[PDB]
Design an enzyme around this catalytic site. Structure first.
Site, PDB file in Angstrom:
ATOM      1  N   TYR A  49       0.825  -1.222   0.000  1.00 33.85           N
ATOM      2  CA  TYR A  49       0.000   0.000   0.000  1.00 33.85           C
ATOM      3  C   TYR A  49       0.852   1.261   0.000  1.00 33.85           C
ATOM      4  O   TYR A  49       0.340   2.350  -0.298  1.00 33.85           O
ATOM      5  CB  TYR A  49      -0.965   0.037   1.205  1.00 33.85           C
ATOM      6  CG  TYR A  49      -1.907  -1.152   1.331  1.00 33.85           C
ATOM      7  CD1 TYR A  49      -2.136  -2.017   0.269  1.00 33.85           C
ATOM      8  CD2 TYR A  49      -2.545  -1.423   2.540  1.00 33.85           C
ATOM      9  CE1 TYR A  49      -2.992  -3.110   0.392  1.00 33.85           C
ATOM     10  CE2 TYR A  49      -3.406  -2.516   2.672  1.00 33.85           C
ATOM     11  CZ  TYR A  49      -3.599  -3.360   1.595  1.00 33.85           C
ATOM     12  OH  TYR A  49      -4.428  -4.447   1.712  1.00 33.85           O
ATOM     13  N   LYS A  78       1.172  -7.579   5.805  1.00 36.71           N
ATOM     14  CA  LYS A  78       1.121  -8.600   4.767  1.00 36.71           C
ATOM     15  C   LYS A  78       2.431  -8.611   3.980  1.00 36.71           C
ATOM     16  O   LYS A  78       2.967  -7.557   3.605  1.00 36.71           O
ATOM     17  CB  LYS A  78      -0.060  -8.374   3.800  1.00 36.71           C
ATOM     18  CG  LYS A  78      -1.331  -8.001   4.518  1.00 36.71           C
ATOM     19  CD  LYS A  78      -2.535  -8.059   3.580  1.00 36.71           C
ATOM     20  CE  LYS A  78      -3.765  -7.409   4.164  1.00 36.71           C
ATOM     21  NZ  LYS A  78      -3.661  -5.923   4.198  1.00 36.71           N
ATOM     22  N   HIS A 111       0.174 -12.213   1.604  1.00 36.99           N
ATOM     23  CA  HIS A 111      -0.849 -11.346   1.018  1.00 36.99           C
ATOM     24  C   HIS A 111      -1.631 -12.065  -0.073  1.00 36.99           C
ATOM     25  O   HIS A 111      -2.863 -11.898  -0.190  1.00 36.99           O
ATOM     26  CB  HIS A 111      -0.177 -10.097   0.484  1.00 36.99           C
ATOM     27  CG  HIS A 111      -1.081  -8.912   0.306  1.00 36.99           C
ATOM     28  ND1 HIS A 111      -0.617  -7.622   0.417  1.00 36.99           N
ATOM     29  CD2 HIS A 111      -2.390  -8.811  -0.053  1.00 36.99           C
ATOM     30  CE1 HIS A 111      -1.604  -6.776   0.174  1.00 36.99           C
ATOM     31  NE2 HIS A 111      -2.688  -7.469  -0.124  1.00 36.99           N
TER      32      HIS A 111
HETATM   33  N1  LIG Z   1      -5.868  -8.800   1.547  1.00 35.85           N
HETATM   34  C1  LIG Z   1      -6.102  -8.160   0.395  1.00 35.85           C
HETATM   35  O1  LIG Z   1      -5.687  -8.566  -0.701  1.00 35.85           O
HETATM   36  C2  LIG Z   1      -6.940  -6.916   0.443  1.00 35.85           C
HETATM   37  C3  LIG Z   1      -7.614  -6.435  -0.669  1.00 35.85           C
HETATM   38  C4  LIG Z   1      -8.479  -5.361  -0.548  1.00 35.85           C
HETATM   39  C5  LIG Z   1      -8.640  -4.761   0.688  1.00 35.85           C
HETATM   40  N2  LIG Z   1      -7.940  -5.220   1.744  1.00 35.85           N
HETATM   41  C6  LIG Z   1      -8.085  -4.459   3.055  1.00 35.85           C
HETATM   42  O2  LIG Z   1      -9.458  -4.219   3.262  1.00 35.85           O
HETATM   43  C7  LIG Z   1      -9.661  -2.794   3.434  1.00 35.85           C
HETATM   44  C8  LIG Z   1     -11.068  -2.379   3.053  1.00 35.85           C
HETATM   45  O3  LIG Z   1     -11.298  -2.658   1.648  1.00 35.85           O
HETATM   46  P1  LIG Z   1     -11.267  -1.481   0.568  1.00 35.85           P
HETATM   47  O4  LIG Z   1     -10.299  -0.409   0.912  1.00 35.85           O
HETATM   48  O5  LIG Z   1     -11.098  -2.214  -0.720  1.00 35.85           O
HETATM   49  O6  LIG Z   1     -12.762  -0.902   0.556  1.00 35.85           O
HETATM   50  P2  LIG Z   1     -14.031  -0.638   1.482  1.00 35.85           P
HETATM   51  O7  LIG Z   1     -13.581  -0.577   2.932  1.00 35.85           O
HETATM   52  O8  LIG Z   1     -15.053  -1.658   1.126  1.00 35.85           O
HETATM   53  O9  LIG Z   1     -14.463   0.785   0.914  1.00 35.85           O
HETATM   54  C9  LIG Z   1     -13.632   1.960   1.064  1.00 35.85           C
HETATM   55  C10 LIG Z   1     -14.375   3.082   0.379  1.00 35.85           C
HETATM   56  O10 LIG Z   1     -15.640   3.322   1.049  1.00 35.85           O
HETATM   57  C11 LIG Z   1     -15.713   4.671   1.451  1.00 35.85           C
HETATM   58  N3  LIG Z   1     -16.449   4.726   2.699  1.00 35.85           N
HETATM   59  C12 LIG Z   1     -15.995   4.326   3.932  1.00 35.85           C
HETATM   60  N4  LIG Z   1     -16.865   4.487   4.899  1.00 35.85           N
HETATM   61  C13 LIG Z   1     -17.970   5.030   4.262  1.00 35.85           C
HETATM   62  C14 LIG Z   1     -19.224   5.454   4.740  1.00 35.85           C
HETATM   63  N5  LIG Z   1     -19.601   5.379   6.029  1.00 35.85           N
HETATM   64  N6  LIG Z   1     -20.093   5.966   3.844  1.00 35.85           N
HETATM   65  C15 LIG Z   1     -19.723   6.043   2.559  1.00 35.85           C
HETATM   66  N7  LIG Z   1     -18.569   5.680   1.997  1.00 35.85           N
HETATM   67  C16 LIG Z   1     -17.728   5.178   2.904  1.00 35.85           C
HETATM   68  C17 LIG Z   1     -14.262   5.118   1.594  1.00 35.85           C
HETATM   69  O11 LIG Z   1     -14.233   6.555   1.442  1.00 35.85           O
HETATM   70  P3  LIG Z   1     -13.236   7.526   2.155  1.00 35.85           P
HETATM   71  O12 LIG Z   1     -11.983   6.821   2.533  1.00 35.85           O
HETATM   72  O13 LIG Z   1     -13.079   8.684   1.115  1.00 35.85           O
HETATM   73  O14 LIG Z   1     -13.949   8.082   3.357  1.00 35.85           O
HETATM   74  C18 LIG Z   1     -13.625   4.409   0.402  1.00 35.85           C
HETATM   75  O15 LIG Z   1     -13.830   5.095  -0.826  1.00 35.85           O
HETATM   76  C19 LIG Z   1      -8.527  -2.195   2.618  1.00 35.85           C
HETATM   77  O16 LIG Z   1      -8.296  -0.820   2.905  1.00 35.85           O
HETATM   78  C20 LIG Z   1      -7.368  -3.100   3.036  1.00 35.85           C
HETATM   79  O17 LIG Z   1      -6.930  -2.746   4.343  1.00 35.85           O
HETATM   80  C21 LIG Z   1      -7.121  -6.282   1.652  1.00 35.85           C
END
Ligand SMILES: NC(=O)c1ccc[n+]([C@@H]2O[C@H](COP(=O)([O-])OP(=O)(O)OC[C@H]3O[C@@H](n4cnc5c(N)ncnc54)[C@H](OP(=O)(O)O)[C@@H]3O)[C@@H](O)[C@H]2O)c1
EC number: 1.1.1.21
Length: 314
Positions: A49, A78, A111
């Site tokens: 990241y 990771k 990861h």
């Molecule tokens: N292991 C892996 O391969 C892998 C892959 C993907 C993700 N992950 C982990 O999982 C985490 C979460 O997944 P993600 O980042 O893909 O997406 P997510 O948490 O599903 O969505 C993040 C998005 O939602 C918005 N958001 C957050 N809270 C909100 C609310 N209350 N109302 C409206 N919009 C809202 C955020 O906006 P703002 O930030 O602009 O507020 C951002 O644009 C990642 O950050 C990472 O740590 C791991």
């Protein structure tokens, strides 16, 4: 419901954490500071990241200022795909530790099951658009992960984006020393994962749900939108909560850990206010009914890797 889940290493993991993928480095320090102020104790990080230094600034400041103690925090990172080689795993872990300004991780995950050729590039590709693999197999990478436990660098080890036969290949590994504590996988109402979740939980492996909100800021995004789904908005209205709060509570009631990402202070606070209401069994089954096997993270450039995870059913 309780704030933490017991892992198979005997430690307790907060079921709600803050995600940091795509969190800009100039915003993620404030995001993590706010998260800790409003009760988050679990931060999900990764070297790939490119923001672990700025995450670490926040953790260190809140430790220095005695807002939280280290034993109360659950910090996850990771091992990236270009460091699956036996001789690179420790250094990769230590770089993450240095950036995070920590002397141990609570959980360190492989990861992806796919190893890439080592080098400066996180995604070395060839002219077919396919990644250049490494010849390390995942059992040897797992043993190198086990060494990190025995050296005190990490309290628990786990896997991410492993399908159930890859999990089983670890669990069957000759001379396996530590079982994976966690499998972190994409999970949300459009990708509900019943089969892989039941397999992991039956083995005592805790599942972490990523992209719980459907990753509306993912780079490759008009596809499905969980947050704008009128059916989910209706359930949220019924409970006088936000759609995001429903989407976060949903995995919690499946005994999953969940890691919504936000850099927005108001949302970081709001996203944590999910311990004061309950989705009904009918709500839960209705949300599960929305499955479409839709992935935010399909790892499109790895579909010919021998360890690509998403060919098999689960
Ligand atoms: N292991 C892996 O391969 C892998 C892959 C993907 C993700 N992950 C982990 O999982 C985490 C979460 O997944 P993600 O980042 O893909 O997406 P997510 O948490 O599903 O969505 C993040 C998005 O939602 C918005 N958001 C957050 N809270 C909100 C609310 N209350 N109302 C409206 N919009 C809202 C955020 O906006 P703002 O930030 O602009 O507020 C951002 O644009 C990642 O950050 C990472 O740590 C791991």
């Amino acid at each position: 419901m309780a704030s933490r889940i017991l892992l198979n290493n005997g430690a307790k993991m907060p079921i709600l954490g803050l995600g940091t993928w795509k969190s800009p480095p100039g915003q993620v320090t404030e995001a993590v500071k706010v998260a800790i102020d409003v009760g988050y104790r679990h931060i999900d990080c990764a070297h790939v990241y490119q923001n672990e230094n700025e995450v670490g600034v926040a953790i260190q400041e809140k430790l220095r200022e005695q807002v939280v103690k280290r034993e109360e925090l659950f910090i996850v990172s990771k091992l990236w795909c270009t460091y699956h080689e036996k001789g690179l795993v420790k250094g990769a872990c230590q770089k993450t530790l240095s950036d995070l300004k920590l002397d141990y991780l609570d959980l360190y995950l492989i990861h992806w099951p796919t190893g890439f050729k080592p080098g400066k590039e996180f995604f070395p590709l060839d002219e077919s658009g396919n990644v250049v693999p490494s010849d390390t197999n995942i059992l040897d990478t797992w043993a190198a992960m086990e060494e990190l436990v025995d050296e005190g660098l990490v309290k628990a080890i786990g896997i991410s984006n492993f399908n159930h036969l890859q999990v089983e290949m670890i669990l069957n590994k000759p001379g396996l020393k530590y079982k994976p504590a966690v499998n972190q996988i994409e999970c949300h109402p459009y990708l509900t994962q019943e089969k892989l979740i039941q397999y992991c939980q039956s083995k005592g492996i805790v599942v972490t749900a990523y992209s719980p909100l459907g990753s509306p800021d993912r780079p490759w995004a008009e596809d499905p939108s969980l947050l704008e789904d009128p059916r989910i908005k209706a359930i949220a209205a019924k409970h006088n909560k936000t759609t995001a709060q429903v989407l976060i509570r949903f995995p919690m009631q499946r005994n999953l850990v969940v890691i919504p990402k936000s850099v927005t202070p108001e949302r970081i606070a709001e996203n944590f206010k999910v311990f004061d209401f309950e989705l009904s069994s009918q709500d839960m089954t209705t949300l599960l009914s929305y499955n479409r096997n839709w992935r935010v993270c399909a790892a499109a450039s790895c579909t010919s890797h021998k360890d690509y995870p998403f060919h098999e059913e689960f």
